[model samples]
Target: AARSIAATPPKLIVAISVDQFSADLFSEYRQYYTGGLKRLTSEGAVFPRGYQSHAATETCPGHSTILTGSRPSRTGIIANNWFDLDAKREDKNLYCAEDESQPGSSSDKYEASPLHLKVPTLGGRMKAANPATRVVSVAGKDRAAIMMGGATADQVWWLGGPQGYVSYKGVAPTPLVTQVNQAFAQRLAQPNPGFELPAQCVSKDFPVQAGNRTVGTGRFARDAGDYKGFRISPEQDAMTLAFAAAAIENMQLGKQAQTDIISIGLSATDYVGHTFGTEGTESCIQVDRLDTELGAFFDKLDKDGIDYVVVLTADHGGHDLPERHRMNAMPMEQRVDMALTPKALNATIAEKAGLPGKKVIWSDGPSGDIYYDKGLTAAQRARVETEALKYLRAHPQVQTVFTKAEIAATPSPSGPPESWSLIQEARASFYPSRSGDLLLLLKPRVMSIPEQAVMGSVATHGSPWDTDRRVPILFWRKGMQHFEQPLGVETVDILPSLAALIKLPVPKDQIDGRCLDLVAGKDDSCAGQL
Candidate 1:
């Protein structure tokens, strides 16, 4: 039987986002965990079927959902990157987490900022309620740190752009971060030696072609002074946790009377998943390392004698490369046809509509969006959208198509897979200001990888399918009741759930998610208002 009494509000809250961590991966590797994962599952309240619940299952939107208690539509983060026809700079691609005010700054070259986020994050709300709250965020990517940290973070850090570890401009690196950077430099100077595959992972240790090289055979051995290699390997997660543990100590988090928050975004899983694909020896070793590293982190917190609560989840899930899928009895799993790309689709639409221009349509990727040429008149744009939709629907890979107007009229989805109606899945991610003119859905198992991989990522995500949308959401604290929930839940639910746990005062009407009661046999109070 579970405990009935409501637990005291914790002094600290730790929110962890493991990039590209699928619920499938959690289930597939659960039996092999004997470290942090094992402890979390055995001692926490686990929701195995947690859903991102939106069509644009990319990094920015997914992380935004975790701490904001809202979907991408409400958060104003529709996609990782979106086309902005009227952007003042030459580059119209708007990165989800960037500041464009700096001169010569385009999305690709701008400093990271949370200016576009329309709502307050859980940390932001907590700080708003009580100014004394200390909020910090750390991650392997700039967007990951910014999204979870929100606009009011006391400190934020990410590893990218040649810096081993970096924080916001005005904020100098703490001695702890400096120490971590030095440690990383020393580690990078040494050879990786590659991970030795455990007995359980040997079955997945065969070579599979991803571009020119075979990926599954990789042990992640890297040459000295390789930054990208460090990012892609399990060493990234190890370094992140080390930095986090140091941050916790340096900041004296949880030692203070008021509640504090620390959000850590582990990036190696996404990188590893992208390069080697999931379901390979590389991912196997990565997850194992994550378990061990996280265990050590938790032990450090325990040594500090802090009462803290942890919520662990993923920004999004991923798909494996098509070549491996075919060998594993999934002949239907395949890379997208080149014809589906925006450039190709534009040419096709131009040829069909008799337009003379070279580029008539554009998008951030091969599917799910379309941006019409800025030179086109309203009537011309309408004609292009209609013709493009017709041509796209004719493609065998297309699952569904929705005009911007159609998505705008649809209500946000609630409840399980069985209850989603019309364009509800896409609607959850669609914001009129940020979304494209025409939205699309591709058939299941059709990867959007181009002829070559991006950043060495052969496999990718950003689909409406379950493989991209499903992730495990687990909550743990010392001496708390433990339960496993297989029922469907949204990542948006995490905020209100934590709100209930910490008794954070947030306006009920402003949030779209309903709080989940963590205390067993308790009345409806823990569910919060409505």
Candidate 2:
């Protein structure tokens, strides 16, 4: 059955994405949900199979799609990281959600901005419609805040490593931003007391042993000796969320003249997912803490009596521990070849082409986006793209290849199993000068790269497969009835749907994602077609 949401409009719209939140985990941990998620899911418009439908399923690209209603390809950010081997001293592996403008900054140490995202975000549209509408974004991670909030936010902040909260404009510092930063700094100044695992978290614990390769028990204690508070614990997530709340109150977010949007990304889930497989007790514990923190935050909002709408979904779905899933009889998973990178391939290209090893202009290795040396002649670039795709195809794990030109030519599709279609849709989002020359999509269950760029565990998304593409989308507002749609849907539909509810003039032609009408007792025309 299909559902349309066009009832009462909400004054404030807040979108939250908890990275690596698998639908599988939600079901397994359903009985233990204690806060906002439990309340929203139980009382809102829920679509369990809301899919992203894109192949470039890395964090940056995935995050870009959530509010913009465009695929990564169109957004020009196909991966969390990509390699560019043009500069004499370094490679340009751009993170779509980051600003890489610092002197001598590599993709690894660069500042993040949503400059690469081509489409205007929901906040962008709102601001353009009326500049008075303030957009504020705060997240435990950069991509979430920047991409969803867009380029026009009044204030935006992301975790700045050991430096606390940092913004995109790099302005001198506003009172709201400074207050959050100052408080975070003070909290971090004192040692992080270990966190205590909730009592209900007992049944969710499990081990992830791959031939003695296990990331220890996932118990987090705040005051305990081993306590790694804000630096490591769910405290990071809390810090960002708390700062977001403060920003709302200080900025007078929804209380202002026009509609306001606050985008918060609860990032600890990904950090926790990286440290412990999604299925383990560590994940369960993180969720439990997140639930409490969220409940408190919502309660604060309720107290303010703000008219708000909350939409929660994930950037993408995650896989369980291969070893555990395998022991239970699922053995399709395999270890990734960590060494397959453009740096590695360029060396081979240099050797085969009989040119100086540095002749390869630039290359973004494996998944997301990769580029060959731009200094090479046109024929040379073409030869390198051909050679690179050929070399990658020879490997058993390599899945699909779309040259820059080829990727640029693909179109975004619409309809069922939208996740699959969106992969092609994102490929079409590539910008000529910004993106890499060769695009790669690794095979499913075949870990393309080992634990190098990311730590603690294995397996990743950068493919057109369903596991990486599928995500659930749930929307909730006050006075709304609970509803669920088990069929396929796209993330692009989110913005338009919300726009209608708020009576906002969202240009239909600007985006590829269709607006879904999700209001109860609305005109029967928009209901249950699928």
For each candidate, the alpha-carbon lDDT, in order, equals: 0.85, 0.69
lDDT of 1 by residue, 1-530 (tens): 34332467788999999999998888899998898888889888898888888889999999999999989999999898888888888888888998766679887677778988889999999999989999999999988999999999998899964468887667787778788888988998887888889777899989888667578877889988787888899998999999998898888999998889999999999999988899899999999898889999999999999888899999987788888999999999887888888777788898776685567787867787787788887887777877888888988988888998899998777778424653888899999877998887888999988655533568998988888898999988887777888888889988988887777866777777778766544454365553
Poorest lDDT segment (10 consecutive residues) of candidate 2: 521-530
C-alpha root-mean-square deviation, each candidate:
1.9, 4.0
lDDT of 2 by residue, 241-276 (tens): 788788778877778667799989878877776656
**Candidate 2 TM-score, true structure as reference:** 0.87
What TM-score would candidate 1 get against the native?
0.96
Q: Which stretches of candidate 2 lie over 4 Å from their true place?
A: 1-7, 83-91, 98-105, 108-112, 189-204, 209-213, 222-231, 349-365, 377-386, 418-429, 451-459, 521-530
Candidate 1 Cα deviation (angstroms), residue 88: 1.4
Once model 1 is optimally superposed onto the true structure by TM-score, how far is the C-alpha of residue 427 displaced, in angstroms?
0.5
What TM-score fits each model?
A: 0.96, 0.87
Q: Which pairs clash (backbone N, Cα, C closer than 3 Å) in model 1?
A: none
Q: Local error of candidate 1 at 221, Å?
A: 0.9
